[PDB]
Amino acid sequence: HMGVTKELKSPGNGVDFPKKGDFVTIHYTGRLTDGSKFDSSVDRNEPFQTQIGTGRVIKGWDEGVPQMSLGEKAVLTITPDYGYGARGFPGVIPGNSTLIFEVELLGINNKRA
Ligand SMILES: C=CC[C@@H]1/C=C(\C)C[C@H](C)C[C@H](OC)[C@H]2O[C@@](O)(C(=O)C(=O)N3CCCC[C@H]3C(=O)O[C@H](/C(C)=C/[C@@H]3CC[C@@H](O)[C@H](OC)C3)[C@H](C)[C@@H](O)CC1=O)[C@H](C)C[C@@H]2OC
Question: Are strands 37-40 and 111-112 parallel, antiparallel or unpaired?
Answer without folding.
Answer: unpaired
